[PDB]
């Protein structure tokens, strides 16, 4: 896969009692889930090589906009974010057998992944609110593109174990 020097790539790795959910993020300056790319759902004991490869694929699709390009304005539009978010919730409930968003989110942990010049910053979080996650302290897993997909998968699972 093609990763460019100086370019930022972002992705997310969420997990609850039914699934792992890997998602491409996009943006400019700050990044967020990019619902242009559907979530990739995986079983909880997916092997490290599949988990690493899936997150690398998600990162490769991460878009960086030119500020105020039609793509940037659309991506950061308040109402479009809301509509795409609600569609994501409804679709994930359908794909995982949930009838309430309360149940979908109850045990959902979240890890963020940032790639830049070969460095992978894999960050755990605290599930602070029903549908939101905030950083915790000094718990990142730092890897790089030197690492095999399997080593990346191990570091992803490690970061998930650090979520609270």
Contacts with Na ion by CB under 5 A lie at: 12, 23, 33
The residue whose Cβ lies closest to Na ion is 12
Nearer to Na ion, 68 or 128 (CB): 128
To which H or E segment does residue 83 belong? Answer: helix 78-96
27-41 burial code (b ≥16 CB/10 A, e <16)? bbeebebbbebebbe
Task: Please give the Cα distance from 57 to 77 (Å, whole number).
Answer: 26
Q: C-beta of 13: minimal distance to Na ion in Å?
A: 7
Q: Which is nearer to Na ion, 92 or 143 (CB)?
A: 92
Give the 3-state secondary structure of 24-65: EEEEECEEEECCCCCCEEECCCCCHHHHHHHHHHHHHCCCEC
Q: From the CB of 159, what's the least distance to Na ion, in Å?
A: 13
Work out how close the CB of 5 gets to Na ion at its nearest, in angstroms, rounded to a whole number. 25
Shortest reach from residue 61's CB to Na ion, in Å: 13
Q: How far is the CB of 14 from Na ion (least distance, A)?
A: 5
Nearer to Na ion, 96 or 148 (CB): 96
Q: From start to end of the chain, where are the E strands? A: 8-15, 20-28, 30-33, 40-42, 109-116, 119-123, 125-129, 132-135, 141-144
Q: Which is nearer to Na ion, 12 or 149 (CB)?
A: 12
User: Which C-beta is closer to Na ion: that of 12 or that of 124?
Assistant: 12
């Amino acid at each position: 896969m093609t990763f460019n020097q100086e370019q930022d790539y972002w992705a997310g790795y969420k997990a609850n009692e039914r699934a792992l959910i890997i998602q491409t993020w996009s943006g400019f300056g700050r990044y967020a889930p990019d619902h242009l790319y559907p979530p990739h759902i995986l079983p909880l004991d997916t092997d490290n090589e599949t988990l690493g490869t899936t997150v690398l694929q998600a990162l490769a699709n991460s878009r960086t906009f030119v500020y105020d390009s039609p793509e940037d304005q659309d991506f950061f539009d308040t109402e479009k974010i809301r509509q795409r978010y609600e569609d994501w919730v409804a679709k994930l409930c359908g794909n995982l057998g949930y009838k309430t968003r309360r149940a979908l989110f109850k045990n959902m942990m979240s890890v963020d992944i940032w790639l830049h010049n070969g460095c992978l910053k894999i960050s755990p979080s605290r599930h602070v609110k029903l549908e939101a996650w905030d950083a915790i302290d000094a718990d990142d897993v730092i890897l790089s593109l030197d690492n095999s997909p399997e080593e990346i998968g191990a570091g992803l699972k490690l970061a998930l174990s650090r979520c609270r």
